[PDB]
Amino acid sequence: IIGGEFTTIENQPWFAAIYRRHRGGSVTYVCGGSLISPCWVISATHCFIDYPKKEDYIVYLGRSRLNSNTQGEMKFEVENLILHKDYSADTLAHHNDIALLKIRSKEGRCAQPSRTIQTISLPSMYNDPQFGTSCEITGFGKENSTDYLYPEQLKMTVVKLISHRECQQPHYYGSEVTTKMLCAADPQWKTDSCQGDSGGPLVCSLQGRMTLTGIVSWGRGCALKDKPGVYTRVSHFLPWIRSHTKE
Numbered sequence: 001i002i003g004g005e006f007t008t009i010e011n012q013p014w015f016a017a018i019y020r021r022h023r024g025g026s027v028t029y030v031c032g033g034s035l036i037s038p039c040w041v042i043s044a045t046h047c048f049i050d051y052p053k054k055e056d057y058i059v060y061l062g063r064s065r066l067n068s069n070t071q072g073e074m075k076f077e078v079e080n081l082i083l084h085k086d087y088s089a090d091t092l093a094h095h096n097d098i099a100l101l102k103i104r105s106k107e108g109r110c111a112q113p114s115r116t117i118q119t120i121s122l123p124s125m126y127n128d129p130q131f132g133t134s135c136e137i138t139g140f141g142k143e144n145s146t147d148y149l150y151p152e153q154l155k156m157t158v159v160k161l162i163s164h165r166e167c168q169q170p171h172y173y174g175s176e177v178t179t180k181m182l183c184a185a186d187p188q189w190k191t192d193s194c195q196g197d198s199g200g201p202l203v204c205s206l207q208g209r210m211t212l213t214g215i216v217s218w219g220r221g222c223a224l225k226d227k228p229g230v231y232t233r234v235s236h237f238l239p240w241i242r243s244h245t246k247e
């Protein structure tokens with residue numbers, strides 16, 4: 001996250017921190033995700049497509065810090081790693097950039113909710129806030145494009161939804177942005193998602209309810225004028241989510 005503020009997991013209790021194990025025993029941060037039910041975290045396919053082996057992954061919930069423990073945090077293996085079969089990537093745009101991780105503790109259990117571990121609601125079908133709505137993003141992504149390490153402490157910021165018409169101007173992203181995506185940005189271009197925030201939540205208040213409206217997906221640079229952050233539009237993937245969270 002460029003700009004915004006440091007935060008703690010109690011403020012974003014659906015946030016999931018996803019890591020990958022390496023030969024030799026090092027663990028690196030991969031991407032964020034969001035708890036959508038006790039057993040299921042939703043994230044972005046581009047985070048996993050090169051290392052699709054579910055055994056390589058560790059998911060934390062209730063975790064506020066990147067490389068140290070948070071009281072109440074819980075650790076999970078990935079029982080099933082589901083990538084979108086229609087995922088693809090062009091020069092800039094990622095398409096169908098959405099994934100599901102079925103989580104389970106080493107004892108075989110799903111998440112137990114607590115003050116620091118909570119589910120976030122899905123939107124209803126094609127139900128999105130109006131453009132100009134303020135929504136929040138959360139992540140362990142870069143604080144500056146020149147950074148080469150992620151921050152140690154979770155961050156959040158607030159961005160506004162941008163219309164498709166604005167986002168599809170040739171000098172923005174033109175037709176690279178589709179109906180299955182949502183753009184959001186800071187009106188002054190000072191705060192944004194960045195590398196490392198992929199897979200994390202774009203949360204908006206929809207009809208009085210905190211809703212997973214988007215998933216951090218792509219964009220050109222970080223907090224660059226006329227280049228919004230682009231998000232998977234969750235409300236256009238409900239049948240996919242429904243079907244893969246079953247058998």
Ligand SMILES: Cc1cc(C(=O)Nc2cc(Cl)cc(N3CCCCC3)c2)cc(C)c1OCCN
Pocket residue numbers: 046047089192193194195196197198216217218219220221222223228229230
């Ligand atoms: C959300 C976001 C993501 C990325 C980014 O690096 N994405 C990305 C895509 C893909 Cl397919 C792979 C990676 N990884 C890069 C590091 C090594 C493993 C692969 C990484 C890059 C940026 C700048 C960004 O922010 C755009 C909104 N300001």
